[PDB]
DNA sequence: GAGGTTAACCGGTGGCAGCAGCTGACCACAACCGATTTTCTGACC
């Protein structure tokens, strides 16, 4: 999750917030994982980690909070 | 060589403002009348 989180430098927060959001995503994925998938755990959890990091970046991006749909159209 | 993955796109919810129709509060006014009260006039003769 450190190697996954390293691709989000310079976007609002420092690295540590991304690291801890990746830990949160790891907790959510390891709750939401099944052993009869026959899937690699990291390849499973990458979507969850990236989702958590991106939504926390959306939440804590700016001084004034902006809703995620306007964040999306700002990105667009 | 599609397997697995991936940003974005594409259904599918609950929140909210409108909003037109429905009260009743509340005023506009409008006369309108009602005691009061002067006070002038009006016959008694």
Can you walk through the features of this model?
This protein is mostly helical and 76 residues long. 63% of the residues lie in helices and 0% in strands. The protein is elongated, with a radius of gyration of 14 Å.
Give the structural class.
Answer: mainly alpha
The number of helical segments is 4
* Strand element count: 0
Q: What form results from the Cα inertia axes?
A: elongated
Question: Secondary-structure element order, as H and E?
Answer: HHHH
Share of residues in strands: under 5%
Major sheet attributes: none
Instruction: Name the helicity range.
Output: 55-70%
Determine the N-to-C terminus distance.
Answer: 27 Å
The gyration radius over C-alpha positions equals 14 Å
Summarize this entry quickly.
This protein has four helices and no strands. It is an all-alpha fold.
Write the layout of secondary structure elements.
Layout: H1 2-5, H2 15-31, H3 41-59, H4 68-75
Helix pairs in contact: 2-3
The chain binds one DNA strand of 45 nucleotides through helix 3.
PDB class: transcription, transferase/dna
Keywords: RNA polymerase, Transcription factor, Mycobacterium tuberculosis, Iron cluster, transcription, TRANSFERASE-DNA complex
Entry title: Mycobacterium tuberculosis WT RNAP transcription closed promoter complex with WhiB7 transcription factor
């Amino acid at each position: 999750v450190v190697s996954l989180a390293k691709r989000y430098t310079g976007r609002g927060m420092a690295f540590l917030d991304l690291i801890q959001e990746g830990n949160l995503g790891l907790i959510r994925a390891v709750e939401k994982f099944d052993y009869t998938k026959g899937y690699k755990f990291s390849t499973y959890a990458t979507w969850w980690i990236r989702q958590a990091i991106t939504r926390a970046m959306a939440d804590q991006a700016r001084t004034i909070r902006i809703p995620v749909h306007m964040v999306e159209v700002i990105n667009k």
